[PDB]
C-alpha cells in the first residue's frame, strides 16, 4: 500500500529541532515525531493519567517524593548510528534541560538538585523540594525529550538542523522554508513504522493549504479556529476532521511597567472592551470557548470564578477619561502572522475601538515575532498556549516575576506580572489536593484583578485527514495540539 505521508502545516519554516528550545507548534510537532522521553503520554492522549513507560521501563520514588529512580529499557537505539541509549544520555539531556543557558524550559526543572547515572541503565533524580508532578517534567513534551550526549557534542549549533532522537521518525533533510523530509527509523524499539516517509510542508497561507488538501496533494492539513472550515471539510465524505486536546489559551499580556498601561485604569479599560464570549460565538463553540481565568480550563487548580472583567465599553471610556485620555488611546502591537493569531488580533482591533482603543497591528512572521516579544518589543502580546494541565506550569511561566522578559530566568511573562509569587511558590510544595487548588485560585484572582493579562478564548487543535489515513490509535489529544505520527500510523488498503 501507500507508505509516504504528505502533511501541510500553518508555518513558514523550522526554527529549531533541539527539544529544549522547540516552542512553536510546528517545531514541537516535528520534535514529537523524532524523540522520545523517560515516560510518555499514551499515543492519542494529552491526559496525564495516561503517563506510562517509554525509555524508562519502570521507576521508584521514596516517601518524601524527592528521590526518583528510573530503570532504562536496554534495547533502545539512537538514530544515525549513535548506538544504545544510556543513563549518561539521560543525565546529559536533563542537565541541559535544567540549564537556562542551554534550554528555553529550565524553569520547569528548578527543583532538580542532581541527575546521576547509578549504572548504564539506572538514572537517579534528586529534588531540593517537592514538585506537583515529577513524571510530568519527564514526559514527551518540552524539556522531557532525551537527546544523545555524543551527537549534541559533535553537531553543536548544527544539532537544531540535524536532530538525533530514538523516536519512530528521523530527519533525512530540511528544505528551508519548504519542507522537512522524515524517514522511518527502521530500528525503532517498538517496531518498524508502517510509513516509510513523511513530507512535512510549510503552507502558512490558509487558502493555498486548503487547495493542496482538497486536490489530494496533502493527506493531512492544519485547519483554523473557524466553524466554517470545520463544516466545509466535513461536507466532503473523503475527509475526517479532528478537534484535538489540549485547548490553547489566547491572552492579551499587557506590559504593566510601560505607559500608558502602568496605570491600572488603562488596563481595566482594555479588559472592559474585549468581548471573549463574542469571539467564541463568532468562531464556533465546538472548537472555541471564552475562559473565565488566566490559565486554560483543563488545568488542575483552574478558577472558574477568578473575577474576569466584564464587557462594558462605556466604563472603558470613563476609565480612560479618568486616566487622562478623554479622546482614547492608540496602541501599536507587534502581531504574529500565524493566521489564527492574525485573525484573532483583527477581531480584538474591531472590539477595542468600542471602548476608545485604536489598536494598530505591526504584522511579523511567527518565529521572528516569537524572538521580538522575548526582547520586550511589544507593549501588549497576543499569545496562545497550553501547558502540562497543572496550574503551576501556566502560572509560573506566564505570571511569576522570575519568568519576566529581561531576566536570565525569563520564560513567557510578557506582562511583567509580580503580584502572585507567594501563592504560586506555596502551591508547588502543597500535597493536599484542596489546599493546593486554593493557593492556585488565589494566584489567578490576583493576576486577573491586577489586569496583567486579559483572557480571550481557548481553542482545540483543528486538523483534517483523508479517509485512507489511519493514526493507528484514536486521536483525542496530543500535548502540542497537533497530530502525533508514530510507528502505528498507516494508509488503509
Ligand atoms: O508553546 C508555546 O509557547 C506557543 C505555542 C503556540 N501555538 C499556536 C497557538 O496557540 C494558536 O493555535 C493560537 O492559539 C490560534 O491560532 C489563535 O487563534 C505558537 O506556536 O505560538
Ligand atoms: Cl512557525
Task: Locate the ligand 1 atom nearest the alpha carbon of residue 461 and give its number.
Answer: 12
Q: What is the 3-state secondary structure (H, E, C) of 405-448?
A: CCCCCCCCECCCCCCCHHHHHHHHHCCCHHHHHHHHHHHHHHHH
What CATH number did the domain enclosing 326 receive? 3.10.105.10
Residues β-bridged to residue 379: none
Q: Is residue 407 part of a domain?
A: yes
Question: Can you say whether the dihedral through the CA atoms of 106, 111, 116, 120 is positive or negative?
Answer: negative
Q: All 3 cell numbers of residue 273? A: 472592551
Q: Is residue 115 part of a domain?
A: yes
Structural domain boundaries, residue 65: 4-166+468-491
Ligand 1 centroid distance, CA of 36 (Å): 22
User: Taking Cα atoms as reference points, which of 58, 59, 13 lies closest to residue 179?
Assistant: 13
Count the Cβ atoms, other than its own, within 10 Å of residue 50.
15
Which ligand lies nearest to the CA atom of residue 482 in the structure?
1
Residues with CB under 6 A from ligand 1: 23-25, 225, 248, 250, 338, 340-341, 344, 384-385, 459
Q: Is residue 334 part of a domain?
A: yes
Under 8 Å between Cβ of 145 and 35:
yes
Ligand 1 centroid distance, CA of 339 (Å): 10
Same domain, 37 and 93: yes
Using what technique was this structure determined? X-ray
Q: All 3 cell numbers of residue 119? A: 549504572
Q: Is residue 216 part of a domain?
A: no
Q: Is residue 290 part of a domain?
A: yes
Same domain, 369 and 268: yes
Q: Is residue 332 part of a domain?
A: yes
Closest residue to atom 19 of ligand 1, CA basis: 24
Same domain, 383 and 478: no
Residue 112 counted as an annotated binding residue: no
Ligand 2 centroid distance, CA of 24 (Å): 5
What CATH number did the domain enclosing 26 receive? 3.90.76.10
Same domain, 256 and 133: no
Under 8 Å between Cβ of 413 and 369:
no
CA distances from 208 to 4, 12, 218, 339, 461 (A): 21, 13, 11, 12, 19
CA distance 447 to 455: 11
Residues β-bridged to residue 237: none
State the angle between helix axes of 421-429 and 391-399 in degrees (0 to 180), rounded to the nearest 10: 150
Ligand 1 centroid distance, CA of 383 (Å): 7
CA distance 453 to 447: 7
Three-class secondary structure of residue 480 per DSSP: coil
Residue 417 counted as an annotated binding residue: yes
Task: Locate the ligand 1 atom nearest the alpha carbon of residue 366 and give its number.
Answer: 21
CA distances from 256 to 260, 310, 384 (A): 9, 20, 19
Same domain, 401 and 278: yes
Which ligand lies nearest to the CA atom of residue 291 in the structure?
1
CA distance 482 to 220: 11
User: Taking Cα atoms as reference points, which of 267, 151, 217 lies closest to residue 466?
Assistant: 217
* Structural domains of the chain, count: 2
To one decimal, the resolution in angstroms is 2.0
Amino acid at each position: 500500500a501507500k507508505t509516504e505521508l504528505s502533511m501541510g502545516v500553518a508555518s513558514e519554516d523550522v526554527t529549531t529541532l533541539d527539544p529544549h528550545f522547540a516552542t512553536t507548534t510546528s517545531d514541537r510537532t516535528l520534535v514529537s515525531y523524532i524523540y522520545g522521553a523517560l515516560v510518555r503520554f499514551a499515543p492519542g492522549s494529552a491526559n496525564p493519567s495516561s503517563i506510562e513507560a517509554d525509555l524508562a521501563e519502570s521507576w521508584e520514588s521514596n516517601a518524601d517524593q524527592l528521590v526518583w529512580t528510573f530503570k532504562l529499557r536496554p534495547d533502545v537505539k539512537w538514530q544515525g548510528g549513535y548506538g544504545n541509549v544510556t543513563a549518561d544520555d539521560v543525565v546529559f539531556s536533563l542537565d541541559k534541560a535544567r540549564d537556562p543557558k542551554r534550554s528555553a524550559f529550565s524553569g520547569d526543572y528548578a527543583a532538580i538538585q542532581k541527575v546521576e547515572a547509578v549504572d548504564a541503565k539506572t538514572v537517579r533524580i534528586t529534588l531540593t523540594r517537592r514538585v506537583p508532578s515529577l513524571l510530568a517534567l519527564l514526559s514527551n513534551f518540552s524539556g522531557g525529550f532525551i537527546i544523545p550526549k555524543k551527537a549534541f557534542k559533535e553537531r553543536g549549533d548544527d544539532f537544531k538542523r540535524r536532530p538525533v532522537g530514538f523516536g519512530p521518525f528521523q530527519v533525512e533533510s530540511i528544505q528551508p522554508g519548504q519542507s522537512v523530509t522524515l524517514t522511518a527509523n527502521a530500528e525503532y524499539f517498538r517496531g518498524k513504522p508502517k510509513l516509510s516517509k513523511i513530507s512535512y510542508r510549510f503552507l502558512n497561507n490558509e487558502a493555498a493549504r486548503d487547495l493542496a488538501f482538497e486536490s489530494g496533494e496533502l493527506d493531512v492539513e492544519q485547519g483554523n479556529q473557524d466553524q466554517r472550515w470545520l463544516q466545509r471539510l466535513t461536507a466532503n465524505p473523503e475527509n475526517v476532521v479532528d478537534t484535538i486536546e489540549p485547548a490553547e489559551l489566547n491572552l492579551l499580556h499587557i506590559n504593566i511597567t510601560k505607559p500608558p498601561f502602568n496605570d491600572i485604569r488603562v488596563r481595566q479599560a482594555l479588559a472592559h472592551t474585549v468581548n471573549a464570549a463574542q469571539i467564541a460565538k463568532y468562531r464556533g463553540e465546538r472548537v472555541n470557548r471564552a475562559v473565565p481565568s488566566v490559565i486554560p480550563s483543563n488545568n488542575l487548580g483552574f478558577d472558574p470564578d477568578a473575577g474576569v472583567l466584564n464587557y462594558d465599553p462605556a466604563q472603558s471610556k470613563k476609565l480612560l477619561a479618568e486616566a487622562g485620555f478623554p479622546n482614547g488611546v492608540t496602541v501599536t502591537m507587534v502581531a504574529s502572522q500565524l493566521p489564527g493569531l492574525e485573525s484573532l488580533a483583527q477581531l480584538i482591533q474591531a472590539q477595542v475601538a468600542e471602548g476608545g482603543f485604536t489598536l494598530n497591528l505591526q504584522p511579523v512572521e511567527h518565529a521572528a515575532w516569537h524572538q521580538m516579544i522575548r526582547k520586550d518589543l511589544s507593549p501588549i502580546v497576543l499569545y496562545g498556549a497550553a501547558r502540562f494541565p497543572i496550574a503551576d506550569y501556566y502560572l509560573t511561566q506566564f505570571y511569576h516575576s522570575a519568568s519576566e522578559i529581561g531576566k536570565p530566568t525569563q520564560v513567557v511573562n510578557f506582562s511583567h506580572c509580580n503580584v502572585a509569587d507567594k501563592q504560586i511558590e506555596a502551591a508547588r510544595t502543597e500535597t493536599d489536593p484542596n489546599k493546593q487548588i486554593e493557593l492556585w485560585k488565589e494566584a489567578q484572582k490576583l493576576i486577573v484583578s491586577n489586569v496583567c493579562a486579559i483572557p480571550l478564548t481557548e481553542n482545540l487543535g483543528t486538523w483534517a485527514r483523508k479517509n485512507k489515513l489511519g493514526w493507528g490509535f484514536e486521536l483525542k489529544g496530543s500535548m502540542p495540539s497537533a497530530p502525533l505520527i508514530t510507528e502505528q500510523t498507516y494508509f488503509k488498503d
